Amino acid sequence: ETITVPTPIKQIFSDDAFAETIKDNLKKKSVTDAVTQNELNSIDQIIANNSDIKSVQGIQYLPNVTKLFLNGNKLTDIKPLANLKNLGWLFLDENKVKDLSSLKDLKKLKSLSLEHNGISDINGLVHLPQLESLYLGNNKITDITVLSRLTKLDTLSLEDNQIRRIVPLARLTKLQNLYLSKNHISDLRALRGLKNLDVLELFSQEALNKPINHQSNLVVPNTVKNTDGSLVTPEIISDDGDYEKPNVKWHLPEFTNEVSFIFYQPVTIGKAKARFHGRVTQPLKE
């Protein structure tokens, strides 16, 4: 938490690439140059996107840093951020930060970006109800329960995850930019109260029905639902099927292991327009 003698930058900051970042931030000549706690205390901002950083060890001695631009590095461990109590913006897109528990005490964090991190558990974000901006695109998330607590969010991206249940978003009325494309969403009722939306994306959903028994004359309830709960009429039905609301119907004279349908609905929420479209797969059992 502090250094008590002038100390080589390369001593404090174990990663070479991070040492080099600190040297450039402080305008030092070399990584072997002695630094003081007073100089480390002057660091408000580190911009080191795309800098091949494997570890931010030594960052613990920068008590005043409020902004970290660390996108496009190779970080796995953020425990060195745990006690940076003034952190306000933290950009970690394209790393491998999987463990979020170190964010717990960052009560000033307003903007967090963790795109493409292989994240599946975001329950540790329950400790950041003050968050206003949250990018979690391109991860492995299914359960967004904790997001119901993040009621200050005006920006949220969850595109390219494996979310079906969007109920946790319903009360998040501050949302202005919401990115939900490439999930598993069939039902938009949760989004109906988001009257402040300016930007909404709902492209390319994939829904999977629980298996049913094949029948030569198959009847399957349509489950794709607009914000008002109404069923979205399908646009293409597989295997020469047809639609008789509320049901999709197929003549399947031989067994086949699946049918499907594709849907599309232009939707308006708040001030925002989006194309909700996707497909529904119905596996069949012999």
Side-chain angles (χ1 to χ4, degrees), residues 135 155-160 177-181 183 199-202:
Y135 284 103
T155 296
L156 176 65
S157 167
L158 294 158
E159 70 192 359
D160 197 346
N177 291 50
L178 184 65
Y179 304 92
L180 291 168
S181 80
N183 285 283
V199 166
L200 177 60
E201 305 188 338
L202 282 175

Side-chain angles (χ1 to χ4, degrees), residues 247-258:
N247 298 124
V248 188
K249 301 165 76 104
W250 287 268
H251 180 223
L252 306 173
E254 309 84 38
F255 173 72
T256 177
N257 66 21
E258 176 206 300

Side-chain angles (χ1 to χ4, degrees), residues 49-61:
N49 293 324
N50 299 298
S51 294
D52 202 42
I53 301 156
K54 296 194 83 44
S55 177
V56 296
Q57 171 58 44
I59 207 178
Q60 304 99 326
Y61 303 91

Side-chain angles (χ1 to χ4, degrees), residues 266-278:
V267 314
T268 303
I269 317 185
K271 323 173 225 82
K273 172 153 172 219
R275 298 183 160 239
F276 175 48
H277 83 84

Side-chain angles (χ1 to χ4, degrees), residues 184-252:
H184 294 175
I185 291 164
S186 30
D187 177 3
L188 303 181
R189 290 181 292 152
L191 302 184
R192 71 199 180 185
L194 296 181
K195 82 183 276 175
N196 298 306
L197 292 166
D198 284 319
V199 166
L200 177 60
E201 305 188 338
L202 282 175
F203 307 110
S204 300
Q205 310 295 333
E206 315 175 334
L208 177 59
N209 291 345
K210 293 183 160 209
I212 63 184
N213 273 277
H214 168 261
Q215 305 295 341
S216 84
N217 287 275
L218 194 77
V219 184
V220 164
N222 189 359
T223 50
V224 179
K225 288 178 132 88
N226 214 328
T227 62
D228 71 345
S230 60
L231 296 169
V232 181
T233 300
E235 175 164 47
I236 324 178
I237 301 151
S238 79
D239 309 78
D240 199 38
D242 50 56
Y243 182 64
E244 182 182 58
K245 178 176 168 172
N247 298 124
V248 188
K249 301 165 76 104
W250 287 268
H251 180 223
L252 306 173

